[PDB]
Amino acid sequence: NSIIVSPRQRGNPVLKFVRNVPWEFGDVIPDYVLGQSTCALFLSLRYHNLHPDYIHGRLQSLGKNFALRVLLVQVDVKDPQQALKELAKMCILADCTLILAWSPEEAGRYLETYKAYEQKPADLLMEKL
């Protein structure tokens, strides 16, 4: 039921806006575990400028364990277009979904939205047999 949150996310104002599903910190590889094989990384564009090698290593340490991988980018920098195009390339090659959030609140809503769905819900009919 709960979103599991990496302690690396501690202090991220996004957490204030995860309000309609429980969340707790846990020892997890992604920034948010949103189900059995779904997870998200969070990246602020301001942070990305300051630490340009950060996200490539993060996406790479993540690998392919989770079926659905989501990079949630907070667009918080004037003139983000060049950064966004490079992150898009990175996501295409790493096969991850790129989502643009324009505020912490929007990012928190995206997290609750992905948590609403099981990527591989129960399949009862096979089970019954």
Which positions lie near Hg ion, rule CB under 5 A? Answer: 30, 39, 41, 69
Nearer to Hg ion, 41 or 45 (CB): 41
Q: How far is the CB of 3 from Hg ion (least distance, A)?
A: 13
> String of b and e for 84-105 (b: at least 16 CB within 10 Å)?
beebeeebeebebebbbbeebe
Contact 38, 30 (CB under 8 A): no
Which lies closer to Hg ion via its Cβ, residue 35 or residue 104? Answer: 35
The rounded distance, in Å, linking the Cα atoms of 44 and 13 is 11
Nearest approach, Cβ of 63 to Hg ion (angstroms)? 10
Q: Which is nearer to Hg ion, 30 or 80 (CB)?
A: 30
Output the residue with the shortest Cβ distance to Hg ion: 69
Of the candidates 55, 70, 85, the residue with the CA atom closest to the CA atom of residue 3: 70
Q: C-beta of 87: minimal distance to Hg ion in Å?
A: 13
Q: Least distance in Å: CB of 57 to Hg ion?
A: 13
The whole-angstrom separation of Cα 22 and Cα 84 is: 31
